[PDB]
Ligand binder design. Structure first.
Ligand SMILES: CC(C)(C)[C@H](NC(=O)C(F)(F)F)C(=O)N1C[C@H]2[C@@H]([C@H]1C(=O)N[C@H](C=N)C[C@@H]1CCNC1=O)C2(C)C
Ligand SMILES: CC(C)(C)[C@H](NC(=O)C(F)(F)F)C(=O)N1C[C@H]2[C@@H]([C@H]1C(=O)N[C@H](C=N)C[C@@H]1CCNC1=O)C2(C)C
Lengths: 295, 296
């Protein structure tokens, strides 16, 4: 199963931020609430917001921050890229051990979808090669965050800002820098063409070998370049030498050389599954990383 | 449309580690009682044919080591209720949520908090299969992991994990120790029955596809409960009941597609196949969303 991380450590950080008539979620860590800067927009500002002008007109008391039933007093504010940082007078007693990290396409994380500062659901995600997320976000979901948890340390990697016309989602890291070529502005924007994460499919095939299945193996091999020439005809990401190195330990563990597994994937794309499933799917799954597979 | 689990925090604060001799698993700590599978009192030899009454009479409180993180909880009483062991402990859990023990029906969904060594590892959303198994991911030491639903404030515990069947699917009990399915907590040959697809859930997920963008599968045709159920029997789909039709009413009202109309869509989807056409994204027809789930 594609598992999300247990969400408790993040649930204790979610709050509600309202400015004017706009309400969204904030992330309360220590004495700072992080939230998307378009909370300071009215709907007449969405098309062409001048955020520096909108923000200089705000005072601390314009920001209503609510953690459950308690209002938090905002005592300062600043803007870092596309996020607003609200200094509050109380440090969150539920702040976990945490860091901010920027992820790269192909990497996975869990999303805690929230509305009105209250958590609604959690699911596991991958950042697509085109820097979008295939999320489940509705109105009021901004400021929901993505995260990993390693040894009780929560690494925040994503904050939600918008939905693109194909139904996919775009946001920032926790320093307010967008993933991909998007802007927090309601103007015509489109996700680039989305490709399958090849190194993740290969890792997952290795996962199936470690488990019971071998039905999809074959006796062929391939050069790296012949693999890429074929796979790109199926909208698969090109496989780099870094990707090959990364699979090395799984190759070691199964005794199947990386380019032999590449030959298997080539044949799977050519043939489909013929009514079979790998692990539990009838799809070539690309939201498990090689790092995930060892764990 | 993602298959989302409930936020797990209220449950994470209840997970403890329970060790009896050389056997270690997970326990659920609520107020001053720890609940866990009774086979924790078994050696990896008792498991073959245990007499649980006998093994429990031979146990004392000092046979049970319970650990909530860094803290050892002192067991001051033990009893058994069906297939679960109840260890009364020194201390009430200060993190006990509002909670209820409930028994669910095949086809209903819940979230699982997978745990190892009393420590939560991950969370995911499940359905109780018609053959009463769970298609989970559970490894050695996962026993005592629980499944749950949350309504507002209240945690409804519905599943406790006990075993893995040879198909790689899973079987457990409700919180009162009653098994789901024709299984026993004994290491002997048992097998999952022939499974089926949860028809009312597929229909719900098609309504979600309509609510969302996808409408290609819609057609002018309709069917009967009787005609559909013989299509169902042929394809290992759970038979569709008049109660299923009724609870799909909200979605039939919301989208304008009557259930026997959507059944014609489902019937044709199960014969044309899907024509390399995708629905939400799935190649197959998803049956792990309830009508309730889709409404929410
Ligand atoms: C989809 C919409 C056409 C409305 C617009 N999209 C584009 O402008 C784009 F196409 F360019 F991306 C859009 O998302 N926004 C408009 C406006 C913000 C944002 C927004 O409303 N954010 C949400 C947070 N509570 C969550 C969204 C709502 C629906 N589902 C989500 O995830 C800003 C980009 C400042
Ligand atoms: C799979 C195994 C052959 C070991 C056996 N299965 C069957 O005996 C059956 F086929 F009959 F079901 C089985 O599960 N057990 C043997 C024995 C308990 C149990 C058990 O070890 N439970 C684990 C709890 N930590 C979780 C399991 C472990 C691996 N993955 C899981 O989920 C009892 C039924 C008393």
């Amino acid at each position: 199963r594609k598992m999300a991380f247990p969400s408790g450590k993040v649930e204790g950080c979610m709050v509600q931020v309202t400015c004017g008539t706009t309400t969204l979620n904030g992330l309360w860590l220590d004495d700072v609430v992080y939230c998307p800067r378009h909370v300071i927009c009215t709907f007449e500002d969405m098309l062409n917001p001048n955020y520096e002008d909108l923000l200089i007109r705000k005072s601390n008391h314009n920001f209503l921050v609510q953690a459950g039933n308690v209002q938090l007093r905002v005592i300062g504010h600043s803007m870092q890229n596309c996020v607003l940082k609200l200094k509050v007078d109380t440090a969150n007693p539920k702040t976990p051990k945490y860091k901010f990290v920027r992820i790269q396409p192909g990497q996975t994380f869990s999303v805690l979808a929230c509305y009105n500062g209250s958590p609604s659901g959690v699911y596991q995600c991958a950042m697509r090669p085109n820097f979008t997320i295939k999320g489940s976000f509705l109105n009021g979901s901004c400021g929901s965050v993505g995260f990993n948890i390693d040894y009780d340390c929560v690494s925040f990697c994503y904050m939600h800002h918008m939905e693109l016309p194909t139904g996919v989602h775009a946001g920032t890291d926790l320093e307010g820098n967008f993933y991909g070529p998007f802007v927090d502005r309601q103007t015509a924007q489109a996700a680039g063409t989305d490709t399958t994460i090849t190194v993740n499919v290969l890792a997952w095939l290795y996962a199936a070998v470690i488990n019971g299945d071998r039905w999809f193996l074959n006796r062929f091999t391939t050069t790296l370049n012949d693999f890429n020439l074929v796979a790109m005809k199926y909208n698969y990401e090109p496989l780099t030498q870094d990707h090959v190195d990364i699979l090395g330990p799984l190759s070691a563990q199964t005794g199947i050389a990386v380019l032999d597994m590449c030959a298997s994937l080539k044949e799977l794309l050519q043939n489909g599954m013929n009514g079979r499933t790998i692990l539990g799917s009838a799809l070539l799954e690309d939201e498990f990383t090689p790092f995930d597979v060892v764990r």
